[PDB]
Amino acid sequence: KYVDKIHIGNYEIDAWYFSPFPEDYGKQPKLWLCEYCLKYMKYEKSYRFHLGQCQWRQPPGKEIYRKSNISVYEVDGKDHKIYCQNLCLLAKLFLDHKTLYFDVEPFVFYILTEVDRQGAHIVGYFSKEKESPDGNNVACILTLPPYQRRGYGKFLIAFSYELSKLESTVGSPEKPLSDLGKLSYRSYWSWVLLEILRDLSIKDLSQMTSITQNDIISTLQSLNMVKYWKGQHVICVTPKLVEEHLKKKPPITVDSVCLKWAP
């Protein structure tokens, strides 16, 4: 038997995939998760007791972004082990290809929250290696199911490249991506590149956006704005073609002004 469903905050969510909740927890049909500290519990009674006792009303670590009622928390895997393990086991219920749950010390986690009077409610996250050999600016990324396809996915994608720009490096998500992941990255890449070309080599676009040359090429390929000549990719842009494509912005965007972060 695997964990079939979770209660988190006011949400009931059915599992998509196996998640190795350890020992007797992994043998429970339903797990009850504190929406703040992400502690996983076996029974409604232990959950209700924890609701009254737990003092956490936000993720741990540093609030590195705040605009209106959207905030992003930076949680270092080394300083907040239990929290980051809890998050990885939650994420694995809804990510097929995530493989790391417990060995979290090498990772930083960026928690997207929407805030009200009660506290900061987890919407989604992405994990990131502190040191990436392959130059991955995102390890795993997820919007929790009840929040999917409402702008939040593209927000965390945007946020990951805002970090990469401040690092003065190029980045690509660790593959494979989910079907949703693939569509959201493509949409984001397109929006960024179209908005620039509306107003420059492929290298220039890579330095401006922190998007890899390969990701830019595949995006310009999908837009039919690149040609191949004697073994070189050539940008073939037409202001009418660019304006026609734009004829969309995500509901919420990352404001660099509201990002308080240094490498």
Ligand SMILES: [Zn+2]
């Ligand atoms: Zn708690």
